Design an enzyme around this catalytic site. Structure first.
Site, mmCIF file in Angstrom:
data_model
loop_
_atom_site.group_PDB
_atom_site.id
_atom_site.type_symbol
_atom_site.label_atom_id
_atom_site.label_comp_id
_atom_site.label_asym_id
_atom_site.label_seq_id
_atom_site.Cartn_x
_atom_site.Cartn_y
_atom_site.Cartn_z
ATOM 1 N N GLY A 1 21.743 92.429 59.763
ATOM 2 C CA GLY A 1 22.501 91.324 59.206
ATOM 3 C C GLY A 1 22.763 91.525 57.724
ATOM 4 O O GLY A 1 22.519 92.596 57.159
ATOM 5 N N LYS B 1 12.708 88.583 57.331
ATOM 6 C CA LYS B 1 11.455 89.318 57.058
ATOM 7 C C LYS B 1 10.808 88.870 55.753
ATOM 8 O O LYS B 1 9.581 88.880 55.630
ATOM 9 C CB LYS B 1 11.689 90.832 56.937
ATOM 10 N N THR C 1 14.306 87.913 62.152
ATOM 11 C CA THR C 1 15.291 87.354 63.088
ATOM 12 C C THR C 1 16.270 88.471 63.486
ATOM 13 O O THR C 1 17.001 89.005 62.652
ATOM 14 C CB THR C 1 16.110 86.239 62.439
ATOM 15 N N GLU D 1 20.576 84.374 66.229
ATOM 16 C CA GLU D 1 19.488 85.193 65.727
ATOM 17 C C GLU D 1 18.202 84.766 66.435
ATOM 18 O O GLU D 1 17.998 83.571 66.698
ATOM 19 C CB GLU D 1 19.406 85.108 64.210
ATOM 20 N N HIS E 1 5.812 87.649 68.704
ATOM 21 C CA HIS E 1 5.023 88.827 68.993
ATOM 22 C C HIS E 1 5.048 89.679 67.738
ATOM 23 O O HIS E 1 6.088 89.820 67.100
ATOM 24 C CB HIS E 1 5.677 89.649 70.114
ATOM 25 N N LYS F 1 19.791 71.303 60.879
ATOM 26 C CA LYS F 1 19.450 70.329 59.838
ATOM 27 C C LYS F 1 19.644 70.946 58.457
ATOM 28 O O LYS F 1 19.588 72.177 58.298
ATOM 29 C CB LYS F 1 17.997 69.810 60.006
ATOM 30 N N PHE G 1 18.110 71.446 54.770
ATOM 31 C CA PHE G 1 16.818 71.364 54.108
ATOM 32 C C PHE G 1 17.007 71.465 52.595
ATOM 33 O O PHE G 1 17.867 72.210 52.112
ATOM 34 C CB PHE G 1 15.874 72.443 54.650
#
Ligand SMILES: Nc1ncnc2c1ncn2[C@@H]1O[C@H](COP(=O)(O)OP(=O)(O)O)[C@@H](O)[C@H]1O
Ligand SMILES: [Mg+2]
Length: 147
Positions: free
Chosen positions: A14, A20, A26, A78, A83, A106, A108
């Site tokens: 991306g 990360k 993601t 994404e 895990h 939403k 934030f």
């Protein structure tokens, strides 16, 4: 309405700074995958099951959003897998079963509220996926083909 939704795609990089940085990576699919989502697919946060290549099936959350950057109203997708992977998996095939909807998108007002929200989505998703009706999807033949 169109759940459970099953799809697979190559894991691709991306833009901007990767999540990360938040300890919550993601994975993205190519635009082709996201473009084949039904419209009854709302933006928001969903939960489900995922595997990478021939790997085991793990819990996951998926965010479906609007893409600011392409012409027409394109969405983004994404997936964060619950895990710990020892290695990145770019280029590998991510197999997903989107089983349930958690919440709408939403706004934030800080990274603190964002990160807390993401963590809470993950904890809620873990609980809901224990419900027998969702737990069984882990065993779907969808995931057996990829092993
Ligand atoms: N638990 C995980 N869930 C999702 N991706 C993971 C996970 N563990 C490792 N990864 C790796 O992290 C990458 C995503 O990192 P991220 O910082 O969001 O960058 P980007 O979105 O640009 O690919 C995935 O492509 C994959 O290679
Ligand atoms: Mg990412």
């Amino acid at each position: 309405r169109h759940l459970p939704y099953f799809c697979r795609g190559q894991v691709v990089r991306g833009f901007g700074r990767g999540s990360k940085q938040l300890g919550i990576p993601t994975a993205n699919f190519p635009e082709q995958v996201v473009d084949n989502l039904p419209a009854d697919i709302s933006t928001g946060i969903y939960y489900g099951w995922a595997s990478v290549g021939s790997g085991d099936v793990h819990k996951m959350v998926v965010s479906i959003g609007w893409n600011p950057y392409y012409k027409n109203t394109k969405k983004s997708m994404e997936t964060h897998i619950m895990h710990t992977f020892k290695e990145d998996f770019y280029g590998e095939i991510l197999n997903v079963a989107i089983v349930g909807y958690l919440r709408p998108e939403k706004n934030f007002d800080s990274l603190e509220s964002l990160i807390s929200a993401i963590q809470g989505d993950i904890e809620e998703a873990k609980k809901r996926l224990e419900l027998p009706e969702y737990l069984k999807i882990k065993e779907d033949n969808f995931f057996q083909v990829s092993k």
